[PDB]
Swiss-Prot record:
Active site (UniProt): E218 (proton acceptor)
Localization per Swiss-Prot or TrEMBL: Secreted; Host cytoplasm, Host cytosol
Effect seen on changing Y346F: About wild-type KM for SNAP25, 35-fold decrease in kcat, no effect on Zn(2+) binding
Site residues by UniProt (Transition state stabilizer): R343, Y346
Outcome following mutation: Y346A: Light chain has 40% cleavage activity on SNAP25, 30% decrease in Zn(2+)
Residues of the full protein shown: 1 to 417 of 1296
Binding, Zn(2+): H217, H221, E242
Protein name: Botulinum neurotoxin A light chain
Signal peptide: none
Modification comment: Has slow autocatalytic activity, cleaves 250-Tyr-Tyr-251, 266-Phe-Gly-267, 419-Phe-Thr-420, 423-Phe-Glu-424, 430-Cys-Val-431, 432-Arg-Gly-433, 438-Lys-Thr-439, and probably 429-Leu-Cys-430 over a period of 4 weeks. Catalysis of the '197-Gln-|-Arg-198' bond in SNAP25 is estimated to be 10(5) more efficient than autocatalysis, leaving the physiological importance of autocatalysis in doubt. Ubiquitinated by host HECD2. Deubiquitination by host VCPIP1 prevents degradation by the proteasome.
Amino acid sequence: SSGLVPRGSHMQFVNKQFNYKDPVNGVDIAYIKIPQMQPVKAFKIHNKIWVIPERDTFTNPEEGDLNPPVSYYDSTYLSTDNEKDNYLKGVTKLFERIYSTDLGRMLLTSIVRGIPFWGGSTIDTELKVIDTNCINVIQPDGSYRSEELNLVIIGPSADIIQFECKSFGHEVLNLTRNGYGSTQYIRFSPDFTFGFEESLELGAGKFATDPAVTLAHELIHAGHRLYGIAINPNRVEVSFEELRTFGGHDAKFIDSLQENEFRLYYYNKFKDIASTLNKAKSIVGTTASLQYMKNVFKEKYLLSEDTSGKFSVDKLKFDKLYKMLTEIYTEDNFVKFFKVLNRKTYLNFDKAVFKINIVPKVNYTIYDGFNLRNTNLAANFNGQNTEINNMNFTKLK
Ligand SMILES: O=C(C[C@]12C[C@H]3C[C@H](C[C@H](C3)C1)C2)NO
Ligand SMILES: [Zn+2]
């Protein structure tokens, strides 16, 4: 058993209990293409969110090969259909675990509403979608259709443990730093994890990071980049972006004056988006209504509208959204909600990498994770202890 529905009748975020064996339908199970490649079978777990149970050899023309030149390699991983089915069920299980918390519900909600801005036109009075913010969805008859999306969960590239949140860029615009946003691609695996040492209070213990926490870390990156408020990776050796995402006392090392300069910068960035929406008179993209799309982005950025239908940015409303995305949505805050053990700083991880399997509910539950209640794994985070609960963790190098 998987234990995907601990309470209720159906899963609360993921729309279907997908099997990889399930036939394509062109709606939530289909072969897709990322804007040369071979069509891959993907699954739509939620609105604007797709899952591709394949190793990432598509997004980067320099990483189209699973060749080994903190890391781990295995070119045989995620090659059989059984693994792809286990990957798929593992990811959906982590979403439900994340969505089982108040913080996770808010984060996922913010992500879905964070539709990438329509700013692909050269006419400043014309709204146009950006091609890289879409995927081609093959139908049963064999025809394409362009579908917009916000988030894609895909398998890791050559280096398996190296999880990251990346997206396609613009030759002129910086979609992740101008407030627009772009379709985020998260390289992730629910079949692996990394370790960290912790003196619990004998000697220090060897624990493993809850994969739910790690996925949440990447989703926070996505939230930043979907609303185009991510920090430039030049700001650092650990970047400010990673330090903000981790949260806790880590993010406090960024001086408050620097924070105010950022917050005011994106406040004006959202203002430019408001002015663009006001000058929008035409729209390219057939059926898509201009009035409907203006409302979509009014909803997204929480813009005010007067009697004459003019959009504008409310000050204390922006600060609410900004604080939510940057200060409330942190890895540290998720650790508190999950009530699990985690490293106290972003870089406080060892080189240890473990093979896991969170799908069986005898191994991992939506409510508790590894630390199963009513057992000996509920005390002192024994479920995350690689020594005690060794049956759940296989040491790798
Ligand atoms: O934060 C990262 C890098 C790392 C993600 C996971 C946690 C640590 C160790 C590994 C796996 C790389 C940082 N990506 O966005
Ligand atoms: Zn990160």
